[PDB]
């Protein structure tokens, strides 16, 4: 029989502090062990838990995983999620003479922004660059950033920075272009942004 490892959900994006549930399922119950790993972008994998075929669960800190070998299932519980939990989580099983990895759950744990102050700022022109750059910043984590209608306007997704000595975190997205009919007033027009977003004069 042919081993197939399934993980759901494919992607999960939740507010910090919530508990999380990651599911793994395998069609062939003749396994030696099941392992859970995390992977950050641009890095290798880190082992979180290894559950031997004779064991029903393993715990490490905020992580607890069950194994129901006859049912072909493991569930990873992450308590009280933190931003630093954001990663791809992989389920793997070791079979007699083969090793199989699931396709992963991509987890994003969003910060709770204490004092939203949404704004779109125009950054200064670079004397080396011919791009114009706009910064949408300080919005709360419920805001979704969309791509531009325009194929020559580039927009990133929200990225969270942490100013730890100030007890302060903030979301931002960057838009840029080198076309001339481009301005920061219009850059995020394809996104639903807060009605109170500050657009400073130039």
């Amino acid at each position: 029989m042919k081993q197939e490892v399934t993980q759901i959900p494919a992607a999960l994006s939740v507010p910090e502090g919530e508990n999380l549930v990651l599911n793994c399922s395998f069609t062939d119950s003749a396994i030696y062990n099941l392992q859970w790993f995390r992977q950050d972008p641009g890095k290798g994998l880190t082992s979180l838990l290894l559950i031997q075929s004779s064991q029903r669960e393993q715990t490490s800190g905020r992580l607890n995983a069950s194994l129901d070998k006859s049912s072909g299932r493991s569930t990873l519980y992450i308590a009280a999620s933190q931003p630093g939990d954001s990663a791809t989580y992989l389920c793997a099983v070791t079979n007699f003479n083969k090793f199989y990895f699931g396709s992963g759950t991509k987890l994003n744990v969003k910060p709770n922004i204490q004092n939203p102050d949404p704004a779109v700022y125009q950054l200064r022109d670079s004397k080396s660059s011919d791009k114009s750059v706009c910064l949408f910043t300080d919005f709360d984590s419920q805001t979704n950033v969309s791509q531009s209608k325009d194929s020559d306007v580039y927009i990133t997704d929200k990225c969270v920075l942490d100013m730890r000595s100030m007890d302060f975190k903030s979301n931002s997205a960057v838009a840029w272009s080198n076309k001339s009919d481009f301005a920061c007033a219009n850059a995020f027009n394809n996104s639903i942004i807060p009605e109170d977003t500050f657009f400073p004069s130039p």
Partner: protein, 244 residues
């Protein structure tokens, strides 16, 4: 601080039909060494595992993917007759015993297989200085770094303030964007932010640098284009604080 799993080389660019040999050194005391291919489309896929100089297990790759292990437990893998779809992160994992002990992974060899080395471009890098409206409204100041026009995606971006590497106040996109989303050879762009206090930005003695390491062509790769050969290089941009 003990060494983790090590892999060499970190980055490779090859053309179709060529061959590569990759090396992995396990953690000291680990004797099981496993290789895996990670791609966007197929995820992690097992190649083969070695213990005490012999292959113990194997995946389903064709015979142009091969491996071996030396008496000190170091392992090499080789791929012949390279194709575009062999572009992947080739990951090594070591373990004391893969049946009952955790896998410890290295950070991989990033291989890009391309049609033609004239598709390879280094990044352009620019720093954009903060908005004065941001400074007056928030008493904070966000610098942006853009790394644009590069191929393949073999870059590492970092920020340095007065010569010291910073992580506080930084966020770099987790992945680059394709500048032409429909094309296999599209060049890439990447953005990063560094936010400081307005007071810190206002000191003209403070120096800010955005560093991008690009891993490119080898001295042995032929080059006959007019433009500069896109060798491994750092491309950087900088700014100084200003009072007004």
């Amino acid at each position: 601080m003990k060494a983790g799993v090590t892999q060499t080389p970190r980055y490779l660019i090859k053309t179709r039909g060529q061959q590569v040999t990759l090396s992995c050194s396990p953690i000291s005391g680990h004797r099981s060494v496993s290789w895996y291919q990670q791609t966007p489309g197929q995820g992690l896929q097992f190649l083969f595992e070695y213990f005490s100089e012999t292959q113990r297990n194997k995946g389903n790759f064709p015979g142009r993917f091969s491996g071996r292990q030396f008496s000190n437990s170091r392992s090499e893998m080789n791929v012949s007759t390279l194709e575009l779809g062999d572009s992947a992160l080739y990951l090594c994992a070591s373990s004391f015993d893969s049946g009952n002990s955790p896998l410890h992974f290295g950070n991989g060899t990033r291989l890009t297989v391309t049609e033609d080395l004239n598709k390879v471009f280094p990044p352009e890098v620019a720093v954009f200085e903060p908005s004065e409206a941001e400074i007056s409204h928030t008493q904070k100041a966000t610098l942006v770094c853009l790394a644009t026009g590069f191929f393949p995606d073999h870059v590492e971006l970092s920020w340095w303030v007065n010569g010291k590497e910073v992580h506080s106040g930084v966020c770099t996109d987790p992945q680059p964007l394709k500048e032409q989303p429909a094309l296999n050879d599209s060049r890439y762009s990447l953005s990063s932010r560094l936010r400081v206090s307005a007071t810190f930005w206002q000191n003209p003695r403070n120096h800010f640098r955005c560093q991008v390491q690009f891993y490119g062509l080898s001295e042995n790769d032929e080059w006959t284009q007019d433009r500069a050969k896109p060798v491994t290089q750092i491309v950087s941009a900088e700014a100084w604080g200003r009072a007004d």
